[model samples]
Each structure stands twice: as C-alpha cells, then as structure tokens.
Target: KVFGRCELAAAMKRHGLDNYRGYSLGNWVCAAKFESNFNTQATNRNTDGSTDYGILQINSRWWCNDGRTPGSRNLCNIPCSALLSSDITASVNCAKKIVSDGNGMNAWVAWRNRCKGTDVQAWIRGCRL
Candidate 1:
C-alpha cells in the first residue's frame, strides 16, 4: 500500500516513531519519503547484493534475514518479507531497533543526505500530528 503523506505520518506516530531516538516525527516521515515514498511494497537492491525492503526500507544486510545477503546478522530477527506488509508494525519496530542499536537515524543514507540538517518539520507541516 502506498500511503499518503499525512496518512503515513499518523501511522508512524501511532507506531511510536515520534521521538523514538531524539528524532522527531517529521524526521521519520522524511526518511520514509526518501526511503520508499511511503510505499509498503518498495524494494531496492544494493551494490553488495543486499536488498532493502518496505516503507522504511529495512535492509537485509544486518537487519532482516533474506537468506541472500551473505553473513546477514538478521539483527531484527525477522524475515525481510515481513517489512513489506501494509501493516507497518514490524517495520517500525525494526527501524527503532536500528536506532537503539546505536546506528541512530544515520543508518539510512537518505536520512543523512536528504533529511539531516534540513527543516524536517516541513515534511509533515499539514499532518495533524
């Protein structure tokens, strides 16, 4: 499911993404906008042969076990496919794990180049937080 901007914002907030790790809801929304454009089924293959999955684009390298990324740690201990569902609970949980693991939001390059040092609040301005 491809979610609208506000729709995704509300959902992320409901999933406890708001201020999950010193990052605001706007930051999370912005990350999703760049990561998967709010599309739950989005997927991208990395140069290392690892794949990114779902709305937040959780990676198979160290997060989800796709059984394809060599030496995958499966830190989230969930299947890579689990991140693709329209229900974003697992995706959000894994995302939080990435942050808690000390990677912070910088784990996603999109957040670094696209969202970092930007006025992330603009991304969710009209969303009724």
Candidate 2:
C-alpha cells in the first residue's frame, strides 16, 4: 500500500502548484483518503451505470473517451487510471486542476461547502492552496 509521493509531488508541480506543503499536503491526502483511500486504480460505476475511475474518482466519460476506450486520446484525455499508466504525475496533475485549479487542498473547502454546508460561495473566498 505504498502511495507514490514523488509522483504526487510531481503532479502538483506540473500544474504550477508550488504552495502545497505540510498541512496543505496532509489536507489533500486526507481528502484523497476519504474519496478513494488513495488508491490510484480505484473505480466505481454509478447507480445509473456510469463509470467513475481512479483515485480521484475521475469520470472518464465526461473527460474523454476512456469510458469507451482507454488510451485513445491524450494522456490526460482519458480516465485517471489511463493517465496514471502514461504519467502518474500528469494524471494527478489533471485531477488537481479539475478539482481545485491546482488548489488540491482547497478542494476540501469547496467540498465541505457544497456537501456539508450551505455556503458554496464562502468555500473559495479565501482558500489558500
């Protein structure tokens, strides 16, 4: 169960995310833990039969043609798993961008606001990484 810290860090860097460190990384790790237990290969088909794939539960269908064929498009054009195989850093980097615009931890703030609280606007007001 050894997660790829170097790959994750590289992912952050690729997205121009240099602010994440210490508590920020911990916070993002916590979120990833909650989402998919940090398993880069995790996947779940929704109740409606739509597939969600990878650590970030990336929906390949929405992002690209991975819901149909893996590795058919650009590395980041498919599921997280596909991107992981091509370049783990790019995969997670894409996730960070899609989730928080490089603010991996700030995704938690946004999630809390959207899921547990009633202030979606407040979640991103002053988020720091």
Candidate 3:
C-alpha cells in the first residue's frame, strides 16, 4: 500500500516515531519519501546480493534474514518478508534497532543525502503530528 504524506505521518506517530533516538518524525518522513515513497511493498536488491525491504528499506545484510543474502546477521530476528507487510510496526521496530545500534539516521543514504541538515519540518507540516 502506498501511503499519503499525512497518513504516513499519523502512522509514524501512532508507533511512537516522534523523537526516536533524537531524530524527529520529519526526518523519518523524509527518509520514507526517498526510500520507498511510503510504499509498503518496496524492495531493493543491492549489488552485494543483499535486499532492502519495505518503507524504511531495512537491509538483509544485518537486519533481516532473506535466506539469500549469503551472510546476514538477521539482527532484528525477523524474516525479511515481515518488512514488506502492509503493517509497518515490524518495519518501524527494526528501524529503531538500526538507529539504536549507533548508526543513527545516517544508516540510510537517502536520509543522509536528502533529509540530513535540512529543514525537514516541512515534511510533516499540517500532519497534526
């Protein structure tokens, strides 16, 4: 399912993404904009044969087990398929783990290149947080 801006914003807040790890919801919203455009089924296969799944594009290399990533740690302890589900709770949880693991929001190149050091408050304006 592809979510609209306010819809995704509300969803993120429902899941407590407002100030997760010092990164505001706007930061996450901006990341979702570039990563998957809020599409729940998005998947990207990297050159290393690792696949990124779902809205936040959790990586198979260290986050989820796709059974095809060659050397995945599956640190999130979830199947990669879970990240593709329409329910983003699992994806959000995994995302928290990623940021909690000391990677910060820099874990996503999309966030670093597009959302970082920018006025991301616009990303969630009118969403009523």
Ordered by TM-score, highest first, the candidates read 3, 1, 2
State TM-scores per candidate. Answer: 0.97, 0.51, 0.97
Q: Point out where model 2 deviates above 4 Å.
A: 1-23, 69-76, 84-87, 100-129
Q: Residue 103: error of model 2 in Å? A: 11
Pitting candidate 2 against candidate 3, the one with the higher lDDT is: 3
Estimate the Cα RMSD of every predicted model relative to the unseen true structure: 0.9, 8.0, 0.8
Residue 69, candidate 2: how far off, in angstroms? Answer: 9.9
Clashing pairs in 1: none
Worst 10 residues of 2 by lDDT: 115-124
What would the TM-score be for candidate 2 when compared with the true structure? 0.51
- Cα lDDT of all candidates, in order? 0.93, 0.47, 0.93
Give the Å error, residue 89, model 3: 0.3
Residues 33-84, candidate 2, lDDT per residue (tens digit)? 5555556666676555455555555555444345454433433455345743
